[PDB]
Nucleic acid binder design. Structure first.
Length: 195
DNA sequence: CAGCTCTGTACGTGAGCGATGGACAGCT
DNA sequence: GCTGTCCATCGCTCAGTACAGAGCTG
């Protein structure tokens, strides 16, 4: 079956997804790594199998239904940027090693200390579990979604964790089951501008 | 024993690819 | 009536998390 218009999966696995980063951003969405479609398109969260653009609209973070082609307009119009913990493309997170994640978390903390957005948004618990242990030296055991009790070191950057936008996750089967975190993220951002 | 990590595993939903079937229209 | 296409429809694949209940170490 052909899902990538004649492009082999082995070619996509060698491709990367660029960062959409700048200064004065309210939010930076940090993914785990690119999926095969993101590597294919060269844009963040294209469908099918991803809830991100649906949740972004349902929560009120965007005024209309946006898509992956709109990712570069997000810093200027919305104050939202994009990065990932791991550079390498795989079909799923389970194809990544501990070594890649730990190297990723180090480069991620450097990137965050340069751009210093108001909120570092972890789109996936697994990446915050690895990051928090490596950076803050905390226990992974009772880790929760939402606002974290630690800031990115040397910055005023907050850490906010969300269930991955991937539709592989059966615990939050629909975009509607994830929207709560997007709404609480919209509220946290609104509170920062208010205060 | 007490807190921790580690690892195999099952799980709902909705989009899209390739195949299928009923409707439909051409054919002095 | 026979032919071949259209286009909705269908059936299969595909796009992390929490849990059980150890093991590990003070």
């Amino acid at each position: 079956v052909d899902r990538f218009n004649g492009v082999s999966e082995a070619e996509l696995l060698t491709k990367t997804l660029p960062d959409i980063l700048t200064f004065n951003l309210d939010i930076v969405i940090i993914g785990i790594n690119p999926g095969l479609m993101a590597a294919y398109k060269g844009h963040h969260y294209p469908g099918p199998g991803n809830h991100f653009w649906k949740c972004l609209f349902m929560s009120g973070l965007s005024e209309v239904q946006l898509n992956h082609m709109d990712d570069h307009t997000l810093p200027g119009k919305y104050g939202i940027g994009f990065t990932n913990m791991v550079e390498r493309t795989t079909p799923g997170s389970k194809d990544l090693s501990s070594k890649e994640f730990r190297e990723g978390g180090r480069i991620l903390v450097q990137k965050l200390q340069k751009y210093q957005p108001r909120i570092a948004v972890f789109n996936g618990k697994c990446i915050y579990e690895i990051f928090s242990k490596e950076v803050f030296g905390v226990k992974v055991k009772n880790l929760e979604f939402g606002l974290q009790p630690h800031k990115i070191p040397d910055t005023e950057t907050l850490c906010y964790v969300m269930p991955s936008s991937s539709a592989r996750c059966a615990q939050f089967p629909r975009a509607q089951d994830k929207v709560h975190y997007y709404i609480k993220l919209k509220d946290l951002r609104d509170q920062l501008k208010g205060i």
